[PDB]
Design a protein around this ligand. Structure first.
Ligand SMILES: [Mg+2]
Ligand SMILES: [Mg+2]
Ligand SMILES: [Mg+2]
Ligand SMILES: [Mg+2]
Ligand SMILES: [Mg+2]
Ligand SMILES: [Mg+2]
Ligand SMILES: [Mg+2]
Ligand SMILES: [Mg+2]
Ligand SMILES: [Mg+2]
Ligand SMILES: [Mg+2]
Ligand SMILES: [Mg+2]
Ligand SMILES: [Mg+2]
Ligand SMILES: [Mg+2]
Ligand SMILES: [Mg+2]
Ligand SMILES: [Mg+2]
Ligand SMILES: [Mg+2]
Ligand SMILES: [Mg+2]
Ligand SMILES: [Mg+2]
Ligand SMILES: [Mg+2]
Ligand SMILES: [Zn+2]
Lengths: 209, 142, 16, 59, 38, 176
RNA sequence: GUGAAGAGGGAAACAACCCAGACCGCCAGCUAAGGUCCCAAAGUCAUGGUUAAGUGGGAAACGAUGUGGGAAGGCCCAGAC
RNA sequence: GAUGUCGGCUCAUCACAUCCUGGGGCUGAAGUAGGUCCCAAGGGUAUGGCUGUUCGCCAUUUAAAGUGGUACGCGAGCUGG
RNA sequence: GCUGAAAGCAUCUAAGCACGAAACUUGCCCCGAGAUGAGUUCUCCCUGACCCUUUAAGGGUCCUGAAGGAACGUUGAAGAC
C-alpha cells in the first residue's frame, strides 16, 4: 500500500490507565497532494507522485512551477513517489490524509539519520580498544592489523575502517501505531525513528507483517 | 607498390538479421564473430573494423547438445573477498537470455579496443521483434 | 633470526 | 595478410584457400600471393577468372 | 545405507541396480544389505 | 521386445484417435491422453494396436515396450478403472472424506487435510479404510503414496497408513 | 646430447625437451617439428569405426546386467529361460 | 651490500576432513537418550586459577566451546614476559 | 517415491511424473545510469542581423544574454576542506 510523507515533531509519552508509559514519536502528517500518476503504458510502472507542505513562491523555479501547475496543486516542499499495488487507483490532484492509517496497526518509518561526521573504528564499528597502560605506545584507539602478509599482499574490499558515519537513509520496521488523530494531523508511533527534530519522514504500512 | 589498406572512413557496412531458433550455440557464434570482424571480405585489415551489423533474434531459443542445459556453469567474481558467483545455462536463459549469446561471441572476438568496438555492432534480442526496420536488414541464413 | 642479538638496543641504526 | 584476403575472396567464388592454391599449382599458374591479394581487391573480375581456372584443373 | 567402494550382493534377495550413475544394492529381505557405491 | 510385440486389443466402445505421436483413448470411465516418444511407431489395425520401433533410434525397442505398457493401462483405465485400498492401524487413527478432501487424524497435534486430484474420488467404508477410484494408474498410485507418507508403517507395532495388501515386517524391542 | 658460450619455429607462459645452427638486404617461393571452428595463419576435408563420461581435459588396489568386437560351450519344439 | 624470533593484544580472511543448529539411511533404534554413515560452510562457536608459555591440568559455564591454511596470518599496527 | 520397459518377472529411470535442507536464486534493508550498453518520464527556456574564405558539423562582426547556475552575505541537529 501507499504511504505518506510527514515530519518529526519530537518524542513524548502516553500514560495508559493501566499505568504503562508508552514512548511515542509525534509525526505531523499534513495532507499529501497527488502531482503525477505513473502508468505502465507511458512510464512502465505504476506509482503516484505526491507533494506536501508549502514553499515560498520566490523559491520555486519556473521548471518546478510548471510541473505543479499541470497537476493544479499548490507547490510543496518536495516530491516523493509511492509504488501502487495493482488494486489501488488514484487521480491527479487528490488529497490523501492521515486517515489512511486508521486501521494499520504497524508501520515502517524511513528517515535520514543524524550525521556524526568522520568517525573512528571504535565508534563506527564497535572495535575494542587496546590497553591504556602496560607499555602501550601511541596505540590506544588505533585499528590494529588490517591484513595478513605476503600471500594476499593486499587489503580486502569491505575492510571496516574509519570514515563518514551517519547522515544516511535508515528504515525502522514494525513500529506499533498508538494514535491516529485526523483533526490535528498527527500520528503517534511507539519508539524512536531516524532523524533529528524537523526532519522529513516516510511512513508506510509494515511490509513484514 | 604497397599492400592495400582499408580506410576506416570509407568502409561500407551492411545490416543483417539472423534467427537463432534451434541453432547450436557455439557454431552460430563462430559465424557471428567472423562477420563482425570482417574476415569474410577481401578488404579485411587487422587494424580496421570492416565487419557488418548483425541483429540476432530469438536468443532465448538457442540450443546446446549433451547435458549442457543443466551442467554448463557461468562463473564471475564480484571483487569482494568471497564474491565467487555461479549460474547454470538454464538459469541464465531464464533470467537474461541475451547474455548467453553475447558472452559466447565476446570470448571469440579479439581482445582490446578494436575488439570492443566490433562487439557494439551485435544486437541480440530475446524475442522475434526488433526496432531497426529503418536500417533495412537483410535475412542471413547462418 | 635475521636481525637479532639486539641493533641500537632496538632502535636500529642510531648513532648521531 | 595476403593469405587471409585470398581466402575471403575465394570463398566468395565458392572455394576454400587450400583447394584454390592446389588448383593453381595443377594448372601451372605461378602468380604469387602478393599479386593474388592485390587482384582480389582491385580486379574482382580477373580474380573470378583465376578461380575458374583452378576449378577446371581440380576437376 | 553402507557407502563403500566395493558394493556386492550379500544374499540371494540382493539386487544390483544403476540409478543415475551410481551402482546401488537394494535388498527386499534385509535393510542392512542396502548399499551405495561411493 | 516381448512386451512391445504383443498387440493391445482395443475393446468395443473405446475410441482411439492417433494424431502424430499424441494418442487419445476415450471410453465410458473417462478420457486419457499422452504423447509418445519419438522412437515409437504406433499403428491402429482392426481392433488392436501394434507398437514397433522407428528407424534411426538406438533405444527403439525399449521405448516401444514402455509405450505398449502405458497404452494398455489407459484402455483398462477408461473401462473398468483402478482401485487402491488403504487401511489405518494404531488406535485413534481415523479418516473421513468430505467432498474431495480427506481428513486424517494420525495422532498429530494438528489436523491433516489432503486435497484429492481432479480425477480421483475417494470413499471411506469404515473409519479405518480408504478406497480410491480413478482412471489413471499413475495418478492413483501417487495419491496413495502421498497418504501413506503422512505416517509410514512403523517397524515395532505396524501402526500407520499401510496399503491393504502390504505386509509389514515387525521386529522385537531389543532384548529384555 | 643441449645449455653454458646459440638466436629462430613448436611445447599457453617455460636455459638444459622437439625441430633447426642467425654474413647483410627483399611487401618472392618450398618445407621441418607442430598444426588447420573463433581468439589466431591454414580442411567446419573425405571414407569406415568407437565414446555419452565434457571421458577427451589429473590419480591406484578393488567394485559393477555401461557399451563395441571375437572365438568357444552347458542348454533348448522329448517346448528351453 | 639484513626476509627481526616464541607467546600475548588488536584486526581478520578462506578450506571442510562439521563442534552446534538444518536434512537423511542403518541400528544389537520401544520411548527418552545414544552408536555409525551420508548431505550441508548460512550464521554461531566461554570466562577464570597456575605457568613467559602455545599446550596442558583444574574450577565453573554453554546449543556448541570444531579442525586446518593464510611468511607455524598480523612488530613501517601495539607489547616485550 | 509413482508409473515403466530394456530383461514376459522384478526395477525411483532409460521415455515420463512427484516430494525433499539454515546451503543456491528470490523475498527484507542500503548503495546504484561513468549500466561509455552513459536509460525513462514530467516541466521550463532561447524564434537577430550582417560580412569573409580554403566552402564547410568553416571563420568573424554588431546586436542580444533567456531558463538556470555560480559567486557574495546571514547560517545549520550538515561538515576536516
Ligand atoms: Mg613501551
Ligand atoms: Mg618509545
Ligand atoms: Mg599513551
Ligand atoms: Mg593475443
Ligand atoms: Mg661461466
Ligand atoms: Mg623459444
Ligand atoms: Mg612462445
Ligand atoms: Mg651460419
Ligand atoms: Mg606450401
Ligand atoms: Mg584463420
Ligand atoms: Mg566433416
Ligand atoms: Mg648481498
Ligand atoms: Mg638490498
Ligand atoms: Mg562434507
Ligand atoms: Mg539463503
Ligand atoms: Mg607467524
Ligand atoms: Mg614490512
Ligand atoms: Mg620491560
Ligand atoms: Mg626479557
Ligand atoms: Zn540381501
Amino acid at each position: 500500500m501507499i504511504g505518506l510523507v510527514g515530519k518529526k515533531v519530537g518524542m513524548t509519552r502516553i500514560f495508559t490507565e493501566d499505568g504503562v508509559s508508552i514512548p511515542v514519536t509525534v509525526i505531523e502528517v499534513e495532507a499529501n497532494r497527488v502531482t503525477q500518476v505513473k502508468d505502465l503504458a507511458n512510464d512502465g510502472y505504476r506509482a503516484i507522485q505526491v507533494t506536501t507542505g508549502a514553499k515560498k513562491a520566490n523559491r520555486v523555479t519556473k521548471p518546478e512551477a510548471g510541473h505543479f501547475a499541470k497537476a493544479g496543486v499548490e507547490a510543496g516542499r518536495g516530491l516523493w513517489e509511492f509504488r501502487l499495488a495493482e488494486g489501488e487507483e488514484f487521480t491527479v490532484g487528490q488529497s490523501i490524509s492521515v486517515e489512511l492509517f486508521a486501521d494499520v496497526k504497524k508501520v515502517d518509518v524511513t528517515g535520514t539519520s543524524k550525521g556524526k561526521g568522520f568517525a573512528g573504528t571504535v565508534k563506527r564499528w564497535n572495535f575494542r580498544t587496546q590497553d591504556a597502560t602496560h607499555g602501550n605506545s601511541l596505540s590506544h584507539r588505533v585499528p590494529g592489523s588490517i591484513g595478513q602478509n605476503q600471500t594476499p599482499g593486499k587489503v580486502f574490499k569491505g575492510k571496516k575502517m574509519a570514515g563518514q558515519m551517519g547522515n544516511e537513509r535508515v528504515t525502522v520496521q514494525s513500529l506499533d501505531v498508538v494514535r491516529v488523530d485526523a483533526e490535528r494531523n498527527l500520528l503517534l508511533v511507539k519508539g524512536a525513528v531516524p532523524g533529528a527534530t524537523g526532519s522529513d519522514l516516510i511512513v508506510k504500512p509494515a511490509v513484514k507483517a | 607498390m604497397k599492400t592495400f589498406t582499408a580506410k576506416p572512413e570509407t568502409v561500407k557496412r551492411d545490416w543483417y538479421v539472423v534467427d537463432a531458433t534451434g541453432k547450436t550455440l557455439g557454431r552460430l557464434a563462430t559465424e557471428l564473430a567472423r562477420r563482425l570482424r570482417g574476415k569474410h571480405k577481401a578488404e579485411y585489415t587487422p587494424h580496421v573494423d570492416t565487419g557488418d551489423y548483425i541483429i540476432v533474434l530469438n536468443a532465448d531459443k538457442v540450443a546446446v547438445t549433451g547435458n549442457k542445459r543443466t551442467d554448463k556453469v557461468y562463473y564471475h567474481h564480484t571483487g569482494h573477498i568471497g564474491g565467487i558467483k555461479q549460474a547454470t545455462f538454464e538459469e541464465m536463459i531464464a533470467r537474461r537470455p541475451e547474455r548467453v549469446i553475447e558472452i559466447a561471441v565476446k570470448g571469440m572476438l579479439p581482445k582490446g579496443p578494436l575488439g570492443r568496438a566490433m562487439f557494439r555492432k551485435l544486437k541480440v534480442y530475446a524475442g522475434n521483434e526488433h526496432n531497426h526496420a529503418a536500417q533495412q536488414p537483410q535475412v542471413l541464413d547462418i | 633470526x635475521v636481525a637479532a642479538x639486539x641493533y641500537x638496543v632496538x632502535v636500529x641504526i642510531x648513532x648521531x | 595478410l595476403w593469405i587471409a584476403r585470398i581466402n575471403a575472396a575465394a570463398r566468395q567464388n565458392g572455394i576454400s584457400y587450400s583447394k584454390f592454391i592446389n588448383g593453381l599449382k595443377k594448372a601451372s599458374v605461378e602468380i604469387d600471393r602478393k599479386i593474388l591479394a592485390d587482384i582480389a581487391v582491385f580486379d574482382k573480375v580477373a580474380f573470378t577468372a583465376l578461380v575458374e581456372k583452378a576449378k577446371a584443373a581440380l576437376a | 545405507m553402507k557407502v563403500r567402494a566395493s558394493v556386492k550382493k550379500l544374499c540371494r534377495n540382493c539386487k544390483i541396480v544403476k540409478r543415475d550413475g551410481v551402482i546401488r544394492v537394494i535388498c527386499s529381505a534385509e535393510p542392512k544389505h542396502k548399499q551405495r557405491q561411493g | 521386445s516381448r512386451v512391445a510385440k504383443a498387440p493391445v486389443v482395443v475393446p468395443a466402445g473405446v475410441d482411439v484417435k492417433i494424431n502424430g505421436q499424441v494418442i487419445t483413448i476415450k471410453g465410458k470411465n473417462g478420457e486419457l491422453t499422452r504423447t509418445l516418444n519419438d522412437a515409437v511407431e504406433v499403428k491402429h489395425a482392426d481392433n488392436t494396436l501394434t507398437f514397433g520401433p522407428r528407424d534411426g533410434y538406438a533405444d527403439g525397442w525399449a521405448q516401444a515396450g514402455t509405450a505398449r505398457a502405458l497404452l494398455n493401462s489407459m484402455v483398462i483405465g477408461v473401462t473398468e478403472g483402478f482401485t487402491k485400498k488403504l487401511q489405518l492401524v494404531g488406535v485413534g487413527y481415523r479418516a473421513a472424506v468430505k467432498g474431495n478432501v480427506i481428513n486424517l487424524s494420525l495422532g498429530f497435534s494438528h489436523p491433516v487435510d489432503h486435497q484429492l486430484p481432479a480425477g480421483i474420488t475417494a470413499e471411506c467404508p469404515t473409519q479405518t479404510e480408504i478406497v480410491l477410484k480413478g482412471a489413471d494408474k499413475q495418478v492413483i498410485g501417487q495419491v496413495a503414496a502421498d497418504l501413506r507418507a503422512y505416517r509410514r508403517p512403523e517397524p515395532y507395532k505396524g501402526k500407520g497408513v499401510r496399503y491393504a495388501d502390504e505386509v509389514v515386517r515387525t521386529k522385537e524391542a531389543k532384548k529384555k
